[PDB]
């Protein structure tokens, strides 16, 4: 009861509702933050979020078309389960089951991966940055210099 009461009190005190746990719409990140750029030779470099968004869109369109067309409950539930699994991969790839893999059998970088670890947004970009008006070289001894 002590463990349970933490979340129940959290949802009780605030005006916010717990219904935000179950999603009915998904937001899409602006294109400039998931860019595809023209590499020479008619080759593009996707941002690896476009694949995860495309899977969600494909599954959602298929389920949407299978409902209006009429179908048994088995098939509709199967499509819903796969749609549920697609959004899980979009938000956190590999937290439940086998990670969705791209070319070369390498797991894709989900939204949660952009924030965690030494290579996340925080530590990599907010707390430490690359800067202008800088340089580096090898140091030697300067016995003739003043302090």
């Amino acid at each position: 009861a002590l463990k349970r009461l933490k979340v129940v009190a959290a949802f009780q005190q605030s005006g916010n509702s717990p219904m935000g746990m179950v999603l009915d719409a998904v937001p899409v990140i602006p294109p400039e933050l998931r860019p595809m750029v023209q590499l020479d030779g008619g080759r593009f470099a996707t941002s690896d979020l476009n694949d995860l968004y495309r899977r969600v869109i494909n599954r959602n369109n298929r389920l949407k078309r299978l409902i209006d067309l009429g179908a048994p409950e088995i098939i509709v539930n199967n499509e819903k389960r796969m749609l549920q699994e697609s959004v899980d991969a979009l938000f956190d790839n590999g937290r439940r089951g086998r990670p969705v893999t791209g070319p070369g059998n390498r797991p894709l970088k989900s939204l949660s991966d952009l924030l965690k670890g030494k290579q996340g947004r925080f530590r990599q970009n907010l707390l430490g940055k690359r800067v202008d008006y800088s340089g580096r070289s090898v140091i030697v001894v300067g016995p003739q210099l003043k302090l």
Binding site: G42, G128, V131, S134
Partner: protein, 1110 residues
């Protein structure tokens, strides 16, 4: 010494070695010819393992075949692997970016078991990359090396772990197979013997024993000597074999209805049906040896057996009981003891052949899966062996191995020694081995079983220390993957010349003496007491009658790179590790010089690395030139050797080869006929001999810094050539028609002057950063139907002329001459990657002199960057006017325990000046055991001090006392080895004598010109608007977390705020501050970084309502 034209390098060695150093590239080459099954390996195994000669491919094809369906009405079998000749020579493959490989054919036979109609065919199995005669592979033009992997052998391992709660010994056993399922038996704090099949909760051993068909009477009959087993049986609670099977099924099969047939079959499938469980031959051998089951029968079969399991359980319970030895019915007795998993008797080597065999094995498993699935979806009598086989997974596995792996690496070609060191490397990290971030300190240690098998010195200095090692000089790998070392057996106190190779366990049983022991010219030790190595590596003093073996020589525990350090035993291991590791970073120089004081390993290491040209057959030289040598053999035939001139290596160094023979000389087989990058007449020459002083000088050689003479720059002593490679290709594209041409949009003619008539720059033209090397334009895309333009294009005929110049420009911080241009083309039916029309490659070369900040080094780990380069007039000079070349600080020598450099300096002076021991009336006592023809030497004599048997201190002192005058009868260096120097800057003599001599120093590949970088403003990133990173783009230096803590500690808030806003990612602040600076105004106030807004958008994309309040 045993090379037909080697230089005369006189040695100080007192001992004589019975055994010659083996071929130093035998590991790779003898591991690959076993894989392909060459006749050479067949003969080698015949004079050894004639009982069962089979290659790796034949083993894979025998374990795979036959492939049968469930009904058993048809089968497919493979046999007789066969290779054709290589598709092209080595040089063509390297030049044209082709993989060096040979076709592979197998004979597949299909049999229908109800019609008897047999159908055989020759099936092409792909192109198989082949190893060259130097131990390398050539994949996609580049030269690669497969590294040998140190793994844990499969077998049974017993270990004891104390218990915290009860302070009781808790023994255990792990049966680790090759590609199978584990099962562990253990004794818990309560006296019971458990089991963990596969990876489940503990169950009593009685359950497994009953499931194997053992009555409660037989168990208590054989396992009746222990209280633990009776206690477990009594509290078993399980009666009847079927009940035990059902319980095991419950534990292993989750949520399935237990039955009798399924439980009966699955247990035997997991461990006894050999399709899901293998031990290999090494695992079977190890299990039989540890338990002593089948000493006589040959190893055929790789599955477990009930005998093995019951023997393992009995061994475990008797080990817990505190027994000493155990005999198993039907097998000889064995000692009952726990195992050490870091013992080189338990660690085996997966060589280059084993790894490729494993990859072929997984490929064949996939192929057979496809074959047996396809055997049921095709109608019979239309099936032919060619319609079942799908070769694509097999060739895919090979590509994956040779392109993507931690053991298949780019050959190290910094200098010739680097590649030889790379080919003799044993790395414990790979797929199937431990990890750099998850390795403790007990696996990084030097176990006493490494003696003679893995060098304890040469290992990486970083976080890889202990996880990567190198093979010793005399070691070889036996058929099971265990390393061996030759030993000279002594029979009844007589040191014989019978060499026997012993692996770590046999070396454990016996008692081994030392190589540098006093043999009395008749194979008899002078005294009875000699240092030896006892069972657990213990060193003691045994009377010289128990000794069984002796080392074939000193220098048996060292590797190739560590055997080239003179006076190694005078240097502590810490600095010798660095001295060995820094010899493979030396860069080839324009002209090479062999050391005055070497060790005798240079010639062998130079001839075995393969960078020299060696006469294949004896004969007389007919024509010599800088490009080739033509030899006329004794019988009609002639051979022309072509040379590599100014060729780039994998690391951007020069790879010259120049002849060392004249037009009339006669050469012999195996004689060096042309030098290489870092060779001087066939011997390794990594550095130069410099005259050195060991004084502190005005604080410029302060804290490991160095002072150089300006003569070394004027006379090009430490100059090197560095070559660069630039590539571009023309590709079709969906729009089509990429073109290499001079007609580039928006480019003037002044920046199109060096280009020749069809794009590429001209050979000989010097370039700077930003210059165009290959002119190229691609379609601008944006194919747009604008009415007037499109109607003009269609019928009127207006051309597209959509172009976007993607030209090849020389990147930032690069320049030099253009030495070569290699252009490929589809018009000449050259083999290019699919979709590519043209491919051009441009080589740019620089010549770099030595300068302040460049890194130098000796062979004893005395590194340091160059602090100053003084003019030749202000340097300490000898009484005859000779300036010193280098000045080293005194404070670094005595504290680091590398006194070998001082002795090298003394012997280098003696060798440079030349000596003569005066045997006017009797040889001096210090020169009594000195070899003959060392009593006198000419100036600039080359000598050698082997690594552990060289020049004594008394001999060095005596040689210093007698050394020749220079031109007039003036001896500049006295008996102590010190000279009186003059101060070339003030003029007065230094008050006390200084140590002078000749040291052999190397130029390391850590030059400043690649290290210096600066930036005011430049390119920025895309997602976040921060500056890029790296010199080749431009990039800024990183201001990390620690540097932010430092500035917060100082209290400087404004410096920190500007560094993170208007220097990194404040998109308007950047332009405003630049404008303010150039216009002389005040720097404005920062805004908000862009990375924070990117963070907010990502948080919102994760369905979080992040909002900033006011």
């Amino acid at each position: 010494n045993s090379v037909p034209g080697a230089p005369n390098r006189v040695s100080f060695a007192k001992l004589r070695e019975p055994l010659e150093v083996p071929g130093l590239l035998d590991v790779q080459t003898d591991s690959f010819e076993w894989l392909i099954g060459s006749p050479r390996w067949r003969e080698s195994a015949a004079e050894r393992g004639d009982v069962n000669p089979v290659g790796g491919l034949e083993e894979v094809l025998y374990e795979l075949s036959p492939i049968e369906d469930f009904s058993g009405s048809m089968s497919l079998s493979f046999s007789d692997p066969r290779f054709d000749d290589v598709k092209a020579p080595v040089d063509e493959c390297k030049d044209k970016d082709m993989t060096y490989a040979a076709p592979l054919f197998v004979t597949a036979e299909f049999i229908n078991n109800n019609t008897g109609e047999i159908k055989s065919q020759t099936v092409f199995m792909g192109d198989f990359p082949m190893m060259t005669e130097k131990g390398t592979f050539i994949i996609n033009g580049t030269e690669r090396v497969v590294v040998s992997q140190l793994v844990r052998s499969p077998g049974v391992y017993f270990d004891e772990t104390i218990d915290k709660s009860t302070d009781k010994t808790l023994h255990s056993v792990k049966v680790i197979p090759s590609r199978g399922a584990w099962l562990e038996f253990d004794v818990d704090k309560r006296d019971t013997v458990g089991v963990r099949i596969d990876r489940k909760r503990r169950q009593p051993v009685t359950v497994l024993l009953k499931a194997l068909g053992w009555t409660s009477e037989q168990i208590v009959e054989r396992f009746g000597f222990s209280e633990i087993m009776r206690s477990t049986l009594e509290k078993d609670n399980t009666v009847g074999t079927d009940e035990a099977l059902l319980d095991i099924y419950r534990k292993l099969r989750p949520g399935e209805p237990p039955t009798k047939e399924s439980a009966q079959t699955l247990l035997e499938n997991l461990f006894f049906k050999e399709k899901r469980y293998d031990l290999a031959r090494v695992g079977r051998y190890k299990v039989n040896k540890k338990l002593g089951l089948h000493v006589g029968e040959p190893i055929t079969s790789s599955t477990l057996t009930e005998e093995d399991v019951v023997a393992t359980i009995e061994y475990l319970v008797r080990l817990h009981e505190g027994q000493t030895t155990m005999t198993v019915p039907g097998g000889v007795e064995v000692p009952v003891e726990t195992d050490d998993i870091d013992h080189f008797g338990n660690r085996r080597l997966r060589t280059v052949g084993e790894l490729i065999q494993n990859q072929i094995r997984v490929g064949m498993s996939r192929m057979e899966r496809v074959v047996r699935e396809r055997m049921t979806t095709q109608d019979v009598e239309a099936i032919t062996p060619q319609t079942l086989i799908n070769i694509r997974p097999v060739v895919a596995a090979i590509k994956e191995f040779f392109g993507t792996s931690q053991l298949s690496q780019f050959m190290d070609q910094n200098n010739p020694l680097s590649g030889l060191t790379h080919k003799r490397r044993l790395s414990a990290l790979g797929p199937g081995g431990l990890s750099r971030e998850r390795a403790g300190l007990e696996v990084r240690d030097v176990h006493p079983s490494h003696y003679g098998r893995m060098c304890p010195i040469e290992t990486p200095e970083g976080p890889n220390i202990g996880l990567i090692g190198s093979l010793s000089v005399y070691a070889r790998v036996n058929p099971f993957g265990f390393i061996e070392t030759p030993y000279r057996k002594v029979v009844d106190g007589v040191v014989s010349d019978e060499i026997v190779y012993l692996t770590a366990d046999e070396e454990d049983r016996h008692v081994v003496a030392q190589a540098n022991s006093p043999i009395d010219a008749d194979g008899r030790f002078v005294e009875p007491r000699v240092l030896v190595r006892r069972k657990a590596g213990e060193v003691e003093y045994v009377p010289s009658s128990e000794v069984d073996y002796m080392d074939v020589s000193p220098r048996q525990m060292v590797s190739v790179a560590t055997a080239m350090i003179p006076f190694l035993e005078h240097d502590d291991a810490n600095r010798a590790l660095m001295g060995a590791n820094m010899q493979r970073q030396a860069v080839p120089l324009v002209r090479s010089e062999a050391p005055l004081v070497g060790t005798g390993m240079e010639l062998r290491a130079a001839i075995d690395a393969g960078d020299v040209v060696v006469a294949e057959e004896s004969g007389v030289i007919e024509e010599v030139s800088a490009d080739y040598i033509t030899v006329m053999h004794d019988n009609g035939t002639r051979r022309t050797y072509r040379m590599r001139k100014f060729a780039r290596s994998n690391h951007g160094t020069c790879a010259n080869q120049c002849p060392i023979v004249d037009a009339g000389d006669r050469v012999e087989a195996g004689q060096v006929i042309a030098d290489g990058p870092c060779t001087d007449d066939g011997e390794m020459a990594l550095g130069k001999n410099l005259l050195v002083a060991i004084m502190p000088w005005e604080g410029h050689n302060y804290e490991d810094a160095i002072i150089l003479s300006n003569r070394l720059v004027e006379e090009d002593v430490l100059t090197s050539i560095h070559i660069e490679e630039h590539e571009i290709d023309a590709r079709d594209t969906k729009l089509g028609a990429e073109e290499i041409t001079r007609d580039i949009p928006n480019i003037s003619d002044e920046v199109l002057a060096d280009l020749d008539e069809r794009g590429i720059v001209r050979i000989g033209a010097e370039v700077r950063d930003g210059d165009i090397l290959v002119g190229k334009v691609t379609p601008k895309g944006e194919t747009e139907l604008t009415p007037e333009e499109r109607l003009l294009r269609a019928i009127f005929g207006e051309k597209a002329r959509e172009v976007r110049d993607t030209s090849l420009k020389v990147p930032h911080g690069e320049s030099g001459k253009v030495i070569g241009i290699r252009v490929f083309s589809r018009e000449d039916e050259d083999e290019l990657p699919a979709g590519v029309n043209e491919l051009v490659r441009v080589y740019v070369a620089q010549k770099r002199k030595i300068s302040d900040g460049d890194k130098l080094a000796g062979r004893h780990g005395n590194k340091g960057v160059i602090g100053k380069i003084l003019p030749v007039e202000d340097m300490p000079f000898l009484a005859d006017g000779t300036p010193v070349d280098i000045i080293l600080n005194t404070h670094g020598v005595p504290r680091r325990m590398n006194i070998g450099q001082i002795l090298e300096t003394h012997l280098g002076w003696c060798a440079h000046s030349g000596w003569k021991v005066d045997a006017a009336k009797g040889v001096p006592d210090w020169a009594a055991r000195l070899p003959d023809e060392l009593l006198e030497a000419q100036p600039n004599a080359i000598v050698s001090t082997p690594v552990f048997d060289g020049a004594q201190e008394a001999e060095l002192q005596g040689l210093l006392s007698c050394t020749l005058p220079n031109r007039d009868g003036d001896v500049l260096v006295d008996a102590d080895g010190k000279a009186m120097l003059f101060d070339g800057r003030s003029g007065e003599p230094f008050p006390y004598p200084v140590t002078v001599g000749y040291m052999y120093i190397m130029k390391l590949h850590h030059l400043v010109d690649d290290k210096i970088h600066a930036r005011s403003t430049g390119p920025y990133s895309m997602i976040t608007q921060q500056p890029l990173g790296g010199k080749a783009q431009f990039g800024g230096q990183r201001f990390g977390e620690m540097e932010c803590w430092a500035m917060q500690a100082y209290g400087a808030a404004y410096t920190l705020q500007e560094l993170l806003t208007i220097k990194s990612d404040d998109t308007v602040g950047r332009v405003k501050v630049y404008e303010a600076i150039v216009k002389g105004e005040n720097i404005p106030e920062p805004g908000i970084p862009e990375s924070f807004k990117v963070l907010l958008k990502e948080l919102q994309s994760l369905c979080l309502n992040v909002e900033v309040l006011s």
